Scaffold this active site. Structure first.
Site, PDB file in Angstrom:
ATOM      1  N   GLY A  55       0.833  -1.189   0.000  1.00  0.00           N
ATOM      2  CA  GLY A  55       0.000   0.000   0.000  1.00  0.00           C
ATOM      3  C   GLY A  55       0.869   1.241   0.000  1.00  0.00           C
ATOM      4  O   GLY A  55       1.922   1.265   0.638  1.00  0.00           O
ATOM      5  N   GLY A  60       4.774   7.915   1.626  1.00  0.00           N
ATOM      6  CA  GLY A  60       5.613   6.732   1.619  1.00  0.00           C
ATOM      7  C   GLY A  60       4.788   5.502   1.311  1.00  0.00           C
ATOM      8  O   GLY A  60       3.691   5.601   0.765  1.00  0.00           O
ATOM      9  N   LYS A  82       8.111  -0.594   6.171  1.00  0.00           N
ATOM     10  CA  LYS A  82       7.550   0.749   6.042  1.00  0.00           C
ATOM     11  C   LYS A  82       8.661   1.747   5.727  1.00  0.00           C
ATOM     12  O   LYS A  82       9.718   1.729   6.363  1.00  0.00           O
ATOM     13  CB  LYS A  82       6.861   1.161   7.341  1.00  0.00           C
ATOM     14  CG  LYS A  82       5.928   0.100   7.919  1.00  0.00           C
ATOM     15  CD  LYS A  82       5.213   0.615   9.149  1.00  0.00           C
ATOM     16  CE  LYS A  82       4.072   1.549   8.770  1.00  0.00           C
ATOM     17  NZ  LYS A  82       3.260   1.920   9.964  1.00  0.00           N
ATOM     18  N   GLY A 135      -3.943 -10.101   3.900  1.00  0.00           N
ATOM     19  CA  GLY A 135      -4.324  -8.713   3.688  1.00  0.00           C
ATOM     20  C   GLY A 135      -5.318  -8.200   4.715  1.00  0.00           C
ATOM     21  O   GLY A 135      -5.387  -8.715   5.829  1.00  0.00           O
ATOM     22  N   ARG A 197     -10.924  -2.249   7.768  1.00  0.00           N
ATOM     23  CA  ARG A 197      -9.930  -1.909   6.754  1.00  0.00           C
ATOM     24  C   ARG A 197      -8.527  -1.780   7.341  1.00  0.00           C
ATOM     25  O   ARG A 197      -7.541  -1.785   6.602  1.00  0.00           O
ATOM     26  CB  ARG A 197     -10.317  -0.596   6.057  1.00  0.00           C
ATOM     27  CG  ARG A 197     -10.318   0.610   6.996  1.00  0.00           C
ATOM     28  CD  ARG A 197     -10.627   1.927   6.292  1.00  0.00           C
ATOM     29  NE  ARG A 197     -10.805   2.964   7.304  1.00  0.00           N
ATOM     30  CZ  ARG A 197     -11.959   3.234   7.905  1.00  0.00           C
ATOM     31  NH1 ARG A 197     -13.060   2.565   7.584  1.00  0.00           N
ATOM     32  NH2 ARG A 197     -11.998   4.120   8.892  1.00  0.00           N
ATOM     33  N   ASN A 198      -8.434  -1.656   8.663  1.00  0.00           N
ATOM     34  CA  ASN A 198      -7.135  -1.483   9.322  1.00  0.00           C
ATOM     35  C   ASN A 198      -6.755  -2.666  10.201  1.00  0.00           C
ATOM     36  O   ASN A 198      -5.836  -2.575  11.020  1.00  0.00           O
ATOM     37  CB  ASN A 198      -7.137  -0.204  10.167  1.00  0.00           C
ATOM     38  CG  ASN A 198      -7.279   1.047   9.326  1.00  0.00           C
ATOM     39  OD1 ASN A 198      -7.954   2.002   9.720  1.00  0.00           O
ATOM     40  ND2 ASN A 198      -6.643   1.051   8.166  1.00  0.00           N
TER      41      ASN A 198
END
Length: 332
Positions: A55, A60, A82, A135, A197-198
């Site tokens: 994503g 970033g 990340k 995911g 979604r998180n």
């Protein structure tokens, strides 16, 4: 370059907060820069191989990678890395350092996405975390949705997972997320954007609460709405939190109630068809609430309703929610 306004460009910010004290009413938060960093986390960046992007946001992205010797000395493993833009300013890189410090402070729990390492010297700042192969839970629920009511049709395949979705899964996800949030709360930590979604899913259908902020640009997600000076997940937010613009332990609990609704609704978006505007804020403040999802057991709908109590003080704590669900399990 040089500017004539002091207001700095938008940049990546630390997402989760740690509370120093509640004197009110109001919250005072820890300044995360003042937390320690343990260099035991430091990992030679040359031992990473970057793969596909998972994503990307405005500042970033998070990428799949292989790491050699990160946890077990002679073994490779898949991780999520990340990163900011390579030329990010040190002030923005410091937000990633503060994130690293908060994750270190929180410590390890099965139901969060855990810290595995970091690259803070020798180049652009990298934070290495757990890779969750299936995911996000919202997409998982949506792909698996049809299998909840049919035992003949082949369930949607997601990586190696070709299994159907059933009530036992939903009850498990409810319990796992409550435990993950109880853990955060026990460390005086507030998430601020709890939602399907998180939350990510990994081997064994284990749910892991994630800080996903770096991995999306919310301008492209209609579940974030312009409200004042911010773009906010308003359908997941507590009314007093929207009104006072403060995130609390009690507003995270409100979000968990909304999460339960979208969970047992198999990935439907909350308040379906309801415009998000002046009228929406008013109706919620005056007591309007969603009704039970078709598939939600009565006791779970009851938890939902208490999470949405207009009085924050009357909402259950995550500790209490965990106890309630464990009571369900024992009686089951």
């Amino acid at each position: 370059g040089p500017t004539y306004k002091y207001l700095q460009k938008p940049m990546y910010e630390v997402q989760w907060k740690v509370v120093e004290e509640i004197n009110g009413n109001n919250y005072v938060y820890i300044d995360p820069t003042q937390l320690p960093y343990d260099h035991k986390w430091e990992f030679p960046r040359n031992r990473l191989s970057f793969g596909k992007t998972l994503g990307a946001g405005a500042f970033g992205k998070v990428v799949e990678a292989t790491a050699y010797g990160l946890i077990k000395s002679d073994a490779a493993m898949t991780v999520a890395v990340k990163m900011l833009k390579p030329s990010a300013h040190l002030t923005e890189r410091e937000a990633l350092m503060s994130e690293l410090k908060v994750l270190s402070y929180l410590g390890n729990h099965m139901n969060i996405v855990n810290l595995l390492g970091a690259c803070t010297i020798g180049g652009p700042t990298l934070v290495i975390t757990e890779y969750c192969c299936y995911g996000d839970l919202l997409n998982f629920l949506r792909r698996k949705r049809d299998s909840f009511i049919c035992s003949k049709t082949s369930p949607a395949i997601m990586e190696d997972d070709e299994l159907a979705l059933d009530l036992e899964d939903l009850l498990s996800f409810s319990y796992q997320v409550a435990k993950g949030m109880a853990f955060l709360a026990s460390k005086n930590c507030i998430h601020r954007d709890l939602a399907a979604r998180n939350i990510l899913l990994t081997h064994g259908r284990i749910t892991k609460i994630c800080d996903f902020g770096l991995a999306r640009d919310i301008k492209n997600d209609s579940n974030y709405v312009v409200k004042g000076n911010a773009r906010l997940p308003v359908k997941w937010m507590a009314p007093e939190s929207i009104f006072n613009c403060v995130y609390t332990f009690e507003s995270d609990v409100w979000s968990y109630g909304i999460f339960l609704w979208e969970l047992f609704s198999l990935g439907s978006s909350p308040y379906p068809g309801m415009p998000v505007d002046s009228k929406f804020y008013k109706m919620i403040k005056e007591g309007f609430r969603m009704l039970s999802p078709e598939h939600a057991p009565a006791e779970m709908y009851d938890i939902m309703k208490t999470c949405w109590d207009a009085d924050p003080l009357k909402r259950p704590t995550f500790k209490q929610i965990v106890q309630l669900i464990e009571k369900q399990i024992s009686e089951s």
